[PDB]
Ligand SMILES: COc1ccc(S(=O)(=O)NCC(=O)NO)cc1
């Protein structure tokens with residue numbers, strides 16, 4: 001399906017979870033974009049105003065799309081593939097407790113997966129892939145994409 005047909009992509013953080021320090025939210029999301037820019041020709045820039053390609057949102061329950069959140073647990077986040085408007089946007093369930101670490105739900109690891117969707121990736125059947133639909137914490141300091149993730153993204157870009 002859809003892919004971004006340009007190399008410079010913008011994102012904007014619509015609002016901030018009260019679960020984390022603001023700078024930690026910024027850094028998690030930045031690091032998650034870097035995972036993908038490492039392996040494609042894409043460049044990502046955070047903008048503070050205006051229409052971004054990728055809007056990052058924290059919201060709970062019904063929040064104006066067809067993908068209502070479900071309280072703590074279950075669905076952690078969802079994202080829309082490349083396109084105009086809501087296309088590219090990544091939404092994180094505020095009913096989760098977002099963290100920089102192994103506690104609650106790790107924002108960085110979740111964001112890597114969601115941004116994969118924002119770039120056009122679907123799910124992987126390989127438990128080793130970040131694009132596998134089940135959340136499982138792994139050490140974020142040594143995190144690496146699986147070969148399956150890299151194959152998937154390189155099928156769309158570069
Ligand atoms: C590692 O990243 C994620 C992100 C979300 C989920 S999930 O919310 O539990 N499943 C729905 C989903 O795949 N959303 O993109 C599971 C893992």
Ligand SMILES: [Ca+2]
Nearest residue numbers: 071073075093
């Ligand atoms: Ca949930």
Ligand SMILES: [Ca+2]
Nearest residue numbers: 053085086087
């Ligand atoms: Ca968008």
Ligand SMILES: [Ca+2]
Nearest residue numbers: 019094096097
């Ligand atoms: Ca929360």
Ligand SMILES: [Zn+2]
Nearest residue numbers: 063065067091
């Ligand atoms: Zn949503």
Ligand SMILES: [Zn+2]
Nearest residue numbers: 113117123133
């Ligand atoms: Zn997913």
